[PDB]
Structure 1
């Protein structure tokens, strides 16, 4: 795996360090990068691309600040459940 991982999450392109994916043990992204690829060779994640932005920031800071009047807290909580990030699930409840 390269140091800088190029991801396609349901159509949205994200770039992150390999270490970041590794950061939470026993999470889904940790299990994934201890693979499906798009036409451009990027690693594919079949999830909502817009909400991944906040999943990625939680992996970076082990905490996430949301935009003011964020209407998708519930949807983000479901994404957190899928990515097996229980502490993030707890923060959203």
Structure 2
């Protein structure tokens, strides 16, 4: 895997470090990006999840804490995304 990973999450393009994707052991992205996969038309790694919500999943992977926009109406949806990506501490934070 390259140092900088190019992702396509349900249509939205994200760039992150490989270390960020494998930062939390036993999580879904850690299982997927183990240093040892579906690709988009432009050769980007594809994740079949909501693109807009992934922005906050990424920031939780970067900081182990995520600040949400004022009057964020998708807390419950982000909790479901956190459940899918298997991030129990983020699930606890969003309950």
Q: In the TM superposition, what is the alpha-carbon distance from 1:20 to its structure 2 partner?
A: 0.3
Poorly superposed stretches of 4+, deviation over 2 Å: none
Provide structure 2 residue ranges, at least 5 long, that are not aligned to the other structure: none
Q: CA RMSD in A?
A: 0.2
Give me the whole-angstrom Cα distance separating, in 1, the residues matched to 2:9 and 2:30.
16
Q: In the TM superposition, what is the alpha-carbon distance from 1:50 to its structure 2 partner?
A: 0.1
Give me the whole-angstrom Cα distance separating, in 2, the residues matched to 1:66 and 1:74.
12
Give me the whole-angstrom Cα distance separating, in 2, the residues matched to 1:24 and 1:16.
14
Q: In the TM superposition, what is the alpha-carbon distance from 1:18 to its structure 2 partner?
A: 0.4
Give me the whole-angstrom Cα distance separating, in 2, the residues matched to 1:38 and 1:70.
30
Q: In the TM superposition, what is the alpha-carbon distance from 1:71 to its structure 2 partner?
A: 0.1
Aligned length: 93
Q: In the TM superposition, what is the alpha-carbon distance from 1:33 to its structure 2 partner?
A: 0.5
Q: Which residues of 2 match residues 1-93 of structure 1 at below 5 A?
A: 1-34=1-34, 35-93=37-95
- SS where residue 67 of structure 2 aligns? coil
Deviations 1:13-47 (A, max 9, x none): 00000000010000000000100000000000000
What's the TM-score, normalizing by structure 2? 0.98
